[PDB]
């Protein structure tokens, strides 16, 4: 109900202690399309964490984390499943919505941005974030919306790890924030879309395969399949291996290390082990399998999982698959 | 055939920064929508025990704040028609569900579940494929918050049909752990006031957590050389007098308490301290009124 | 074009050397529904292999191999992907189609059957296969069709491994054959359906987890997740472990054995290793990861993969996931 | 701008009981629809070499039997718009594709691919994301069959536009393997008549397989102490005279052959036997006519 | 002729009890509306450098809060068509202007300036009567507030025409002070990232303040016996590695930093400490991206 505000003459503006909006589940609509099907739907992305210094994407350094492609589950938790089934996609309507979850007492800037080039570097300064053509800025306690005008180019879901992603993605969503304080988030981000899918195909596959010749270099790798991680997410240095799954959800991992010896498997950052972890160590080679739940929020100093005190690490081959916790290993 | 309508309190939502489903309780059926499930139907179970089958006609979950306007975050309310499906682990998954609602902790919220026409069985405690005996499961979540003071309370309002009068299932819960075998695991029979993880039995302490609001009558019989003190430093308060009998090798305590239902990870609903060589815990918990509390 | 047959008077019947029908891709149709979506589509199942003695389902002994449930990829190679996304389903139209791929010279019977109870045992005798209410019999060189009349009960995709499957499946398809000869198949089986999906949900998961306490018994197990295998498909006896993936496709496997020692990993039956197999053996525990392609046709004596000369096998924990060959391990 | 229409032969389909895609060739782009791809465009490449970009206006794949009516099984024809997608492994996957057709080996069949309006680059040999430079890939499969005699032949018929005249890309293929380093791997430049696996270099034998139909001019220079005989026991026949120069440390053979294009796993297109201490193979293959065959 | 439209960030407004114009900066043209003026056009200057003349078609200044609702005071936004007029000194004078707007620090605000039809010259750095080369000046003010946390941010949105392509003016600023002559005054050439008062050169310290938001590449060459430490304790953070060369009599530091643009009177954007006998400071500042930061 509307109330009268004490001490205001007509046409005044007021600041309340907090602003909100109810969000309700809405089942996806299926619509007529040039291709196989058009889906009109709405998905939660992430919560904007507060930071004093300017940070983008809650601190995730991966370029194109929220690349607009149906096969990117960092942006589409559900559409990923749908992407599996088709070759090509076209976004028809695209908008990003910000709902504050903090009081009007909270300081800071929340910027919701879209960059047409999904491979462009993340901005770091206040001039940069303000200079995007497709931008929307607000106080963290205010509602906001960014409408991205779509084109009519069909693109491939990148299920073959295209190197020049920009040509298969419809740009990238990103958000930035500064001059905030406290432990709790500013507000929530949603994507609302209308998307067409073109060509039915065999399921693309939910597995990610990572392979690094550490003996060649502690950096670089081959990554095939779903892009749950990027190269920089796997740290192999100084007798430690750290793997950062900075996309939320549940994942099955099998990691096989070519190394003389290894120490403990620790879960000391954004993830928790689910059920039992299966570890087999030998002279020259080790293997670990387990399934974890990740909050997906990036951590500077503590990986999703780490392997400690590792000696003469020559090679990392690993397999990561989004899955159900039901499938965890037993004690 | 027998038509019941009611509204009843379920649980208070504790604030949390990270996502927390069902106040951190990990169990998959916690709030299965079946009138036997006293964790969801704090009031209805007392009637459910007398009948064989149920069908919900109207069903909605309500959230009413008990916190201030300066509390941050969100409270999600959620219904899955598959009562065996795993709990969601990240906030985005919650939005994948067809039937959910989400709001500020300081705002009233409602989630209406569209009911079907199928009858299902009142007892689900034997049943293995529980989805076939439950009308889905309710879940709640919260994130982006802070504080010890609960955000608000959840309630269920429904119109339900019951079908066949039967011998009473009873309102008592019986717990039994052979702690000499293991400090975890147990046989629990009757109504689900507690689950295994709710009875902590370690380091010379016994704590039991009744994390379902109400007034209860308990009797714990302890197989142990000696025990120390019965304490109530958690979500429950002693009602009337506590009756304690201690001997070498065995102890019995019986009392009625009043639980707030809200889980506390530091202090149990009641605890018994300085417990020496605990071999066995056997216990009886029964929802009741405070009128039957023991006298001084 | 129609031809005149030499030596026939009007109204004669003739046997040609072979009969065929072109099959063409048809993209799925999406239609109005009480629930979220109705899919009208058509999928290839299997080819009926010839056998002298009566065999059902090309020799697969698993009851309900072709159970009618969208989450069963033995029956729906594509609908499985779609099932991931929803809670409940209802078949509206269901038919099974047989196209011969052999000449009119070939002997035998091909029976296409549907049993309303998906947990019923497989038939073994000619009286049995003939006694199903929903049956269709032909010579192997003739076309055939079986139309199953659908009901309007909604069922759950069994993504929580229901024990009484019959209550979550719409019966089971099965096919039988006898008095055939030769190496090549008789003909092909297709399923044509109209199916409604009810409730959007988080992806169910593509992973299967198998766990057997061999120290307790060489038989029995816990299986969670997708049902790519059943208990009897994992053989643990006489110093051998054999795993039978008798559903076609590509699978990621991680198998962890509690056993003093193990011998060779062999691929000697219906599957081929893709890329490299990663093996780590220690005293008391071994781990293998690899991805294979399976033809899915069951083999009596040679498993999909086997582990030989295994000593004091105490426990098998394994993880199997349908995937892309792209994700295979590198050399 | 320059508008070409043509029909041309691709490959003969060998029978197989198990599923066999692209006659057992494992490579993902084998029949990428790009006019440079001589494995698909046996005729068009000769024109493609002179232009920068292409656009298909009409495109269809045809299958014409060469086998008898008593041949069992099926021949599948198939188009994926993603030329980098893996080959299907089981028959059911083939049916998941939007654009496929399937028939008896004794029956004519056709698959019409609906073309788009986008121009793409003629050279894909540098390109990494080949889907962006190919108009998908063609695939064929067969199963449930038997015999050594091919089921039938595949053809492509199209109307294609070429855009910019350029310096010729050439019709020659250059192969180079440092066998002293490894018996596999190689540098291959120019047109894709062969791929690494097509040159077998082991056990004192050299076999090369030109599994694309046509007439070719070859020159192989061998770094080796001595070599034995040049033989043609596979899918190819010598045309005219073979010119052979042998010395201690090096050999050169040059000849034009006529390949049937159909792969043979026992006998290569040409082989050279009793080869001692092979260090290096360098070779040149060029599509041509038989008029330029060497004389006796 | 060349038509540009854009929106870009100008400055964050620091709270103040007494009236404070332009965050305390005293200079009369600070925000002259001329595309060369990088203090106002943080983004446009990069284009302005390539053209001779400009004309604004649409022009508006926006204020978006970054502070809380409990912040007191007002933020004034203001446009004077005379870019040489003195800054106002008291709040009442601000209201004398035809084009101003004023609001709470917690409220969005806008000021629309009606543009004219006259073309003016891009370079104003030579010009003496700057009003004839600027389309007025923008000013902001705040009063009746408190706190260190900025109230909100100002932005300019415009549609502007550029006229003649020219040799680039460049994006580099060159600063030069003969400190042996005086600790104040300097020659500054190129873009106005800094003004004399922004380089403090006294008591054995050197501090430079880049009070315009962005990422910059700097090179300072110091004529001095010895220097101590380079520090970043103000509005800027080092990006990548700092390259430092020290000798007896001269030092050079080069690095790229990231400035918040907001002035700090205690700590400069970067400082160099324990500096002995500073005779001369020569420096180069260039707006850039962080991709060109120096490596470790
Ligand atoms: Ca694809
Ligand atoms: Ca495809
Ligand atoms: Ca389910
Ligand atoms: Ca569900």
Can you give the C-alpha Rg of chain A in angstroms?
22
On whether the CB atoms of residues C288 and C279 are closer than 8 A, the answer is yes
By three-state DSSP, how is residue B243 classified?
Answer: strand
Distance CA A98, CA A102 (A): 12
For residue C140, the chain D residue with the least C-alpha distance is: D72
- Name C305's bridge partners: C243
For E196, how many CA atoms within 13 A lie in the half-sphere containing its CB?
Answer: 11
Which pair of structure tokens corresponds to residue B80? Answer: 């899955």
User: Which residues neighbour D13 within 8 Å (Cβ) at sequence distance 6 or greater?
Assistant: D23, D63, D75, D105, D140, D142, D150, D151, D152, D153, D154
For Cα atoms D81, D86, D89, give the angle at the middle one, nearest 5 degrees: 115
Helix (H) or strand (E) holding C243: strand C240-243
CB atoms D90 and C295 under 8 Å: yes
Distance CA E162, CA E35 (A): 10
For Cα atoms D171, D173, D176, give the angle at the middle one, nearest 5 degrees: 165
Which pair of structure tokens corresponds to residue C5? Answer: 């047959």
On whether the CB atoms of residues A65 and A169 are closer than 8 A, the answer is no
Query: Tokens 């008391």 belong to which residue?
Result: C284
Distance CA D69, CA C118 (A): 39
Query: Tokens 């008591």 belong to which residue?
Result: E203
E255 to each of A239, E237, E248, E251, E267, how far by Cα in Å?
Answer: 32, 10, 21, 14, 18
Phi, psi torsion values for D92, nearest 5 degrees? -60, -35
Q: Where are the beta strands (DSSP E) in E14-98?
A: 20-21, 31-32, 53-65, 74-80
Distance CA E99, CA C290 (A): 72
Q: How far is E53 from chain A (nearest CA, A)?
A: 22
User: Which residues neighbour B293 within 8 Å (Cβ) at sequence distance 6 or greater?
Assistant: B239, B240, B241, B255, B256
Distance CA B294, CA E59 (A): 81
Closest CA relative to residue A272, chosen from A243, A293, A242, A250:
A293
Which pair of structure tokens corresponds to residue D14? Answer: 């060998």
Which pair of structure tokens corresponds to residue B61? Answer: 């979950």
A134 to each of A89, A112, C273, E40, how far by Cα in Å?
Answer: 22, 9, 48, 21
Distance CA B10, CA B20 (A): 16
Nearest ligand, measured from the Cα of C155: 3
For residue E237, the chain A residue with the least C-alpha distance is: A53
Distance CA A304, CA D210 (A): 51
Distance CA C240, CA A304 (A): 37
CB atoms B131 and C159 under 8 Å: no
Closest CA relative to residue A235, chosen from A56, A61, A59, A46:
A61
For Cα atoms B41, B46, B52, give the angle at the middle one, nearest 5 degrees: 90
- CB-nearest to A13 from E64, E107, E261 is E107
A interface with B, Cβ–Cβ < 8 A, is 17-18, 20, 22-25, 27, 42-47, 77-78, 101-103, 105-106, 183-185, 188, 190, 248-250, 293-296, 324-326
User: Which residues neighbour A64 within 8 Å (Cβ) at sequence distance 6 or greater?
Assistant: A118, A119, A165, A169, A172
Helix (H) or strand (E) holding C188: strand C187-197
Which pair of structure tokens corresponds to residue A180? Answer: 């905030």
Nearest ligand, measured from the Cα of A156: 1
| Sequence-ordered alpha helix ranges (H) in B53-108 | 91-94
D122 to each of C199, D5, D156, D286, how far by Cα in Å?
Answer: 47, 17, 18, 19
By three-state DSSP, how is residue E45 classified?
Answer: helix
Helix (H) or strand (E) holding C147: strand C144-148
On whether the CB atoms of residues B228 and B273 are closer than 8 A, the answer is yes
A84, A160, A250: best to mutate for the C interface, most C CBs within 10 A: A84
User: Which residues neighbour E229 within 8 Å (Cβ) at sequence distance 6 or greater?
Assistant: E272, E273, E274
- Supply the DSSP string of D115-164, one letter for each residue: P-S--EES--SS-SSGGGTSS-EEEEEEES---SS--EEEEEEEEEEE--
E95 to each of B81, E23, E79, E89, E90, how far by Cα in Å?
Answer: 64, 18, 11, 12, 10
Distance CA B145, CA B48 (A): 36
Distance CA B98, CA B86 (A): 16
Distance CA E93, CA C217 (A): 93
On whether the CB atoms of residues A208 and A228 are closer than 8 A, the answer is yes
Q: Where are the beta strands (DSSP E) in chain E?
A: 2-13, 20-21, 31-32, 53-65, 74-80, 99-103, 109-113, 120-121, 137-143, 152-162, 172-177, 187-190, 199-202, 205-208, 214-223, 230-231, 236-246, 250-259, 270-272, 280-288
C328 to each of A224, A291, C318, C325, how far by Cα in Å?
Answer: 9, 19, 17, 6
Nearest ligand, measured from the Cα of C200: 4
For residue C253, the chain A residue with the least C-alpha distance is: A254
Distance CA C241, CA C316 (A): 9
Query: Considering Cα of A117, then A120, then A122, then A128, what sign does the dihedral take?
Result: negative
Which pair of structure tokens corresponds to residue B196? Answer: 């295994």
Distance CA E253, CA E272 (A): 10
- Name B293's bridge partners: none
B15, B87, B92, B185: best to mutate for the A interface, most A CBs within 10 A: B92
Distance CA E208, CA E268 (A): 5
On whether the CB atoms of residues C39 and C30 are closer than 8 A, the answer is yes
Breaks (C–N over 2.5 Å) after residues, chain B: none
A18 to each of A102, C70, E19, how far by Cα in Å?
Answer: 7, 46, 30
Distance CA D198, CA B5 (A): 78
Distance CA B242, CA B217 (A): 11
Q: Which residues of C90-124 are buried (b: 16+ CB within 10 A; e: fewer)?
A: bbbebbbbbbbbbbbebbbbbbbbbbbebbeebbe
For residue B129, the chain C residue with the least C-alpha distance is: C162
Distance CA C244, CA C306 (A): 9
Helix (H) or strand (E) holding C317: strand C315-322
Distance CA E128, CA E137 (A): 15
Pairing label, strands A172-178, A55-56: antiparallel
Helix (H) or strand (E) holding D101: strand D99-103
Q: Which residues of B28-52 are buried (b: 16+ CB within 10 A; e: fewer)?
A: bbbbbbbbbbbbbbbbbbebbbebe
Helix (H), strand (E) counts: chain B: 2, 20
Which pair of structure tokens corresponds to residue E107? Answer: 């409220």
For residue E261, the chain A residue with the least C-alpha distance is: A126
Distance CA B172, CA B285 (A): 6
Distance CA E120, CA C185 (A): 85
Closest CA relative to residue E63, chosen from E140, E154, E141, E142:
E154
Distance CA E47, CA E170 (A): 10
Helix (H) or strand (E) holding B34: none
On whether the CB atoms of residues A296 and A249 are closer than 8 A, the answer is yes
C231 to each of C168, C242, C272, C321, how far by Cα in Å?
Answer: 20, 12, 22, 16
D139 to each of C250, D55, D78, D121, how far by Cα in Å?
Answer: 19, 20, 5, 21
Cα B93 → chain centroid:
24
Which pair of structure tokens corresponds to residue A122? Answer: 């993340």
Helix (H), strand (E) counts: chain C: 2, 22
Closest CA relative to residue A71, chosen from C253, D126, C324:
C324
User: Which residues neighbour B283 within 8 Å (Cβ) at sequence distance 6 or greater?
Assistant: B174, B175, B176, B199, B208, B218, B219, B220, B221
User: Which residues neighbour C98 within 8 Å (Cβ) at sequence distance 6 or greater?
Assistant: C48, C110, C112, C136, C138, C143, C144, C145, C187, C188, C189, C190
CA D196 to ligand 4 center in whole angstroms: 50
From chain A, pick out residues whose CB is under 8 angstroms from the CB of E41.
none
- What's the resolution in A? 2.8
User: Which residues neighbour C289 within 8 Å (Cβ) at sequence distance 6 or greater?
Assistant: A254, A256, A287, A289, A319, C252, C253, C254, C255, C277, C278, C329
Distance CA A244, CA A62 (A): 11
User: Which residues neighbour B176 within 8 Å (Cβ) at sequence distance 6 or greater?
Assistant: B186, B187, B188, B280, B281, B282, B283
On whether the CB atoms of residues D48 and D122 are closer than 8 A, the answer is yes
On whether the CB atoms of residues C257 and C307 are closer than 8 A, the answer is yes
Which pair of structure tokens corresponds to residue D192? Answer: 């894709």
CA B11 to ligand 1 center in whole angstroms: 47
For Cα atoms C183, C188, C193, give the angle at the middle one, nearest 5 degrees: 160
- CB-nearest to C319 from A36, A78, A289 is A289
Query: Tokens 């349908």 belong to which residue?
Result: C322
Domains in chain A, CATH or no CATH each: 26-203 (2.60.120.20), 204-331 (2.60.40.4030)
Distance CA D275, CA D205 (A): 6
CB atoms C24 and D98 under 8 Å: no
Distance CA A254, CA A324 (A): 15
C interface with B, Cβ–Cβ < 8 A, is 36, 87-88, 156, 159-160, 162-164, 167-168, 198-202
Distance CA C140, CA C129 (A): 16
By three-state DSSP, how is residue D290 classified?
Answer: helix
Nearest ligand, measured from the Cα of D136: 2
CB atoms B100 and A325 under 8 Å: no
| Helix (H), strand (E), coil (C) string for chain A | CCCCCCCCCCCCCCCCCCCCCCEECCCCEEECCCCCEEEEEEEEEEECCCCCCCEEHHHCCCCCCEECCCCCCCCCCCHHHHHCCECEEEEEEEEEEEEECCCCCCCCEEEEEEECCCCCCCCCCHHHHHCCCEEEEECCCCCEEEEECCCCCCEECCCCCCCCHHHCCCCEEEEEEECCCCCCCCEEEEEEEEEEECCECCCCCCEEEEEECCCCCCCCCEEEECCCCCHHHEEEECCEEEECCCCCEEEEEEEEEECCECCCEECCCCEEEEEEEEEEEECCEEEEEEEEEECCCCCCCCCCEEECCCECCCEEEEEEEECCHHHCECC
Which pair of structure tokens corresponds to residue C106? Answer: 């070939």
Phi, psi torsion values for D11, nearest 5 degrees? -165, 155
E242 to each of A300, C263, E155, E219, E260, how far by Cα in Å?
Answer: 22, 57, 32, 10, 19
For residue A157, the chain D residue with the least C-alpha distance is: D82
Q: Where are the beta strands (DSSP E) in chain B?
A: 2-13, 20-21, 31-32, 53-65, 74-80, 99-103, 109-113, 120-121, 137-143, 152-162, 172-177, 187-190, 199-202, 205-208, 214-223, 230-231, 236-246, 250-259, 270-272, 280-288
Q: How far is D37 from chain C (nearest CA, A)?
A: 23
CB atoms C295 and D18 under 8 Å: yes
Provide the Cα torsion A284, A289, A295, A299; round to 10°: -10
Distance CA D82, CA D137 (A): 7
CA A270 to ligand 3 center in whole angstroms: 27
The experimental method is X-ray
Query: Tokens 């990003």 belong to which residue?
Result: A96
Q: What length does chain D have?
A: 296
Distance CA E268, CA E4 (A): 34
- CB-nearest to C184 from D17, D69, D109 is D17
User: Which residues neighbour B250 within 8 Å (Cβ) at sequence distance 6 or greater?
Assistant: B221, B222, B223, B224
D200 to each of A304, B44, D270, how far by Cα in Å?
Answer: 46, 79, 11
- Name C148's bridge partners: C94
- Name C256's bridge partners: C287, C317
On whether the CB atoms of residues C216 and C110 are closer than 8 A, the answer is no
Distance CA C323, CA C325 (A): 7
Pairing label, strands C109-115, C172-178: antiparallel
Distance CA B195, CA B202 (A): 16
On whether the CB atoms of residues B221 and B282 are closer than 8 A, the answer is yes
Which pair of structure tokens corresponds to residue D205? Answer: 């034998």
Chains B and A touch (3+ CB pairs under 8 A): yes
- Name E66's bridge partners: none
CA C88 to ligand 4 center in whole angstroms: 9
């Amino acid at each position: 109900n509307i109330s009268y505000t004490e001490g205001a003459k007509p046409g005044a503006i007021s600041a309340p202690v907090a602003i909100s909006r109810r969000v309700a589940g809405m089942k996806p609509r299926f619509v007529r399309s040039e291709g196989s099907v058009k889906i009109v739907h709405r998905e939660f992305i992430a919560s904007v964490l507060p930071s004093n210094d300017l940070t983008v994407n809650n601190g995730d350094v991966n370029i194109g984390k929220y690349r607009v492609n149906p096969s990117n589950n960092a942006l589409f938790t559900w559409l990923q499943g749908q992407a599996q089934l088709y070759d090509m996609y076209r976004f028809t309507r695209l908008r990003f919505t910000y709902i504050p979850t903090t009081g009007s007492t909270s300081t800071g800037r929340v910027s919701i941005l879209w960059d047409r080039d999904s491979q462009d570097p993340l901005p770091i300064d206040r001039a940069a974030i303000s200079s995007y053509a497709h931008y929307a800025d607000s106080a963290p306690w205010a509602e906001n919306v960014l409408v991205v005008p779509c084109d009519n180019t069909w693109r491939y879901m990148n299920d073959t790890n295209a190197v020049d992603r920009k040509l298969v993605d419809f740009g990238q969503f990103l958000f930035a924030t500064y001059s905030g304080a406290g432990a709790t988030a500013h507000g929530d981000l949603y994507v609302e879309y209308a998307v067409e899918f073109k060509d039915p195909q065999p399921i693309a596959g939910m597995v990610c395969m990572f392979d690094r010749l550490v003996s060649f270099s502690e950096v670089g790798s081959t990554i095939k399949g779903v892009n749950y991680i990027a190269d920089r997410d796997v740290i192999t240095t100084g007798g430690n291996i750290g793997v950062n799954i900075n996309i939320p959800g549940t994942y099955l991992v099998t990691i096989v290390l070519n190394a003389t010896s290894i120490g403990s498997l620790t879960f000391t950052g954004n993830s928790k082990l689910v059920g039992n972890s299966l570890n087999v160590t030998s002279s020259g080679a080790s293997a670990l399998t387990f399934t974890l739940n990740s909050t997906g929020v990036p951590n500077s100093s503590n990986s999703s999982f780490s392997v400690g005190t590792v000696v003469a690490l020559t090679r990392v081959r690993m397999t990561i698959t989004r899955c159900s916790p039901e499938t965890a290993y037993l004690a």
